[PDB]
């Protein structure tokens, strides 16, 4: 047992590619808060858990706080909850199971749960011709957004 007050602190540094695993985004959403995931599928894949880590229970699929757990999942979304949240915490752990034994567990990930854009919206009526007005905006007023199409 060399265990002492030494403060070496080796790596294990985060490999690339090229084997299974499991992210989470939030993306191409409507105007209801949700998240969502995404898989590499593999030989046999398994069971999938995830968490909230705060004080409180920010989001929560259930009623109260849940954990929502899920066999075999390629690319599926998850729902959230209401609190004064901008940034919640998600520790997800896999046991992927493709071989014997392997496993990628506590990729505690802090996803991000905000509309990028802000929308506000103006309505003239002329007689039997209507217009809009589509007054756009960031939510966040230090971070600005590009745009695509609209």
């Not at 997800?92 to 802090?110: A, P």
């Not at 991000?112 to 756009?136: A, G, R, T």
């Amino acid at each position: 047992c060399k265990e002492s007050t030494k403060v070496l602190v080796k790596q294990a540094h985060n490999l690339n590619l090229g084997e299974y695993a499991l992210e989470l985004k939030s993306v191409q959403s409507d105007a209801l808060e949700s998240l969502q995931v995404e898989v590499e599928v593999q030989k046999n894949i398994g069971n999938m858990k995830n968490l909230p880590v705060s004080f409180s229970m920010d989001e929560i699929q259930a009623r109260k706080r849940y954990n929502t757990p899920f066999e075999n999942v390629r690319l599926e979304y998850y729902l959230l909850d209401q609190i004064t949240a901008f940034d919640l915490i998600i520790k997800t752990s896999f046991t992927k199971k493709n071989d014997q034994g392997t496993f990628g567990e506590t990729k505690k990930v802090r996803i991000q749960c905000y509309l990028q854009l802000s929308v506000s919206v103006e309505d003239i009526f002329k007689k039997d011709i209507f217009f809009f007005k589509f007054l756009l905006n960031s939510s966040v007023r230090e971070e600005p957004v590009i745009l695509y199409s609209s």
